[PDB]
Design a protein around this ligand. Structure first.
Ligand SMILES: *C(=O)[C@H](CCSC)NC=O
Ligand SMILES: [K+]
Ligand SMILES: [K+]
Ligand SMILES: [K+]
Ligand SMILES: [K+]
Ligand SMILES: [K+]
Ligand SMILES: [K+]
Ligand SMILES: [Mg+2]
Ligand SMILES: [Mg+2]
Ligand SMILES: [Mg+2]
Ligand SMILES: [Mg+2]
Ligand SMILES: [Mg+2]
Ligand SMILES: [Mg+2]
Ligand SMILES: [Mg+2]
Lengths: 98, 70
RNA sequence: GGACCUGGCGGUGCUUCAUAUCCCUCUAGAGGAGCCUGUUCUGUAAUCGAUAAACCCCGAUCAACCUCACCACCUCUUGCUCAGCCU
RNA sequence: AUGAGGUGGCAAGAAAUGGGCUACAUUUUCUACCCCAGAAAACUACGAUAGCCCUUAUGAAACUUAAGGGUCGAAGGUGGAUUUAGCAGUAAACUGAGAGUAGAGUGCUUAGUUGAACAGGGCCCUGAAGCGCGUACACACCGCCCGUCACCCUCCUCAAGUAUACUUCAAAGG
RNA sequence: AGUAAGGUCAGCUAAAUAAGCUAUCGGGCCCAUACCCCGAAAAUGUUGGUUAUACCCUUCCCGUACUACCA
């Protein structure tokens, strides 16, 4: 469900989501998924559950999700995949033959 | 005679006086620190005279005055 | 760079003027309407030139074809010209 | 083929602008006359040379060019800012001819008729002449030229903290 | 969403005669471009009732102020 919350004279679209597999963390980056397409890439502006801010929601926990990008449109069936990004040392592809 | 050589100096002085009014607060800091090295360089010259004359400490009852104050 | 010369200019001075002239002054007009006509924009596959005074019923005392240089299509090759070209 | 020839064809008008013609009428309109007249006269008036329809003329060819007739009877009711011409047989108004074309202009050239008003007082303006002044202009006042704010390029200075390097010491005393 | 106060031309201000000044458009002025000078366009958010007229009343629309309220 998509909710419109009025805080500070600003309409905040809130995406109500149900965690199916895994957990969501405030720090870890997110991306929006529409029927397999990738709509958005970024971090949540506010993670708030049951009127209480929770950093880590476990599997099966209900959580309302608001993005920092107001242009993002939330539908009834959109999917969201959270992910953790770690920089990895890259080695040169050049092999000299020995 | 014309004043084409005065008009060149007219703007030079105007631009210089307008730059000092814009940087007047930074110039007060530089001059204060420029007067601290000038006084310490004066204290080093006097300390070279009694160290090269064979003494170890300044003559009794001698204090180097701050000659770069207001 | 200094000092001169000439010329131009000056919201530069004096004086004297402008006779259809700068202004006021006399007379009929223009800009207002409709039409004719030219030009500029726009448009079209579809000329050119003039274009402040000193262009704008100007070249044209003049375009239905011709004029015609323009456009489209077709055609010819020592070709009206001891060539030709409004390039 | 940037040459030559043939067939067909476009040259329009949302808009703006210049010049001109005709008018908004009663000093007029129509008729007779060519200056002693009678009518008209505001929603059947004044006023289109436009539109539409027909005919005719020229021409091989005309909704198309021009003329005429018929129908039609609009705007317009005297024109903002500004602006043009003209010193006398002139302006204004009226009339005719001609060039050029097969034909074609409200255009041009030209002949004639009737026939005015102001003309005087000034020096900002437009412009001139004479004697002057000034001038950094000379592609000449649409001239020349001064500063702020930009990329790029070049050099210099200041400067916090720190680091390196160099210099001096015995040219001394016990 | 409610409650309060509200609504002009592109803006704004007066009047309800709908005008004035900017913005816009075109013309004029100049050598030309500005300024400037002239003209034209532009409506009273909407429904009617209501009255000279909408300035009154009402319908609906939008925003303003505040609050309810919502992950
Ligand atoms: C919001 O409160 C959230 C909505 C879930 S919609 C299935 N629920 C719990 O925090
Ligand atoms: K001179
Ligand atoms: K007139
Ligand atoms: K006219
Ligand atoms: K005219
Ligand atoms: K008549
Ligand atoms: K500059
Ligand atoms: Mg200088
Ligand atoms: Mg032409
Ligand atoms: Mg032909
Ligand atoms: Mg040719
Ligand atoms: Mg009649
Ligand atoms: Mg007729
Ligand atoms: Mg002929």
């Amino acid at each position: 469900a998509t909710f419109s919350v009025t805080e500070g004279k600003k309409k905040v679209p809130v995406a109500g989501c149900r965690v199916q597999k895994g957990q969501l963390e405030k720090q870890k980056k997110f991306k929006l998924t529409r029927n397999g397409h990738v709509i958005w890439k970024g971090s949540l502006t506010s993670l708030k559950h049951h009127k209480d801010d929770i950093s880590i929601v476990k599997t099966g926990m209900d959580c309302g999700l608001s993005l920092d990008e107001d242009n993002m449109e939330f539908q009834v069936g959109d999917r969201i995949v959270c992910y953790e990004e770690k920089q990895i040392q890259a080695k040169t592809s050049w092999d000299p033959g020995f | 005679k014309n004043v084409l050589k005065i008009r060149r100096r007219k703007m030079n002085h105007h631009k210089y006086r307008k730059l000092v009014k814009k940087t007047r607060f930074l110039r007060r800091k530089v001059q204060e620190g420029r007067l601290r090295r000038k006084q310490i360089k004066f204290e080093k010259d006097l300390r070279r005279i009694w160290l090269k004359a064979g003494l170890k400490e300044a003559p009794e009852g001698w204090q180097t005055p701050k000659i770069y104050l207001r």
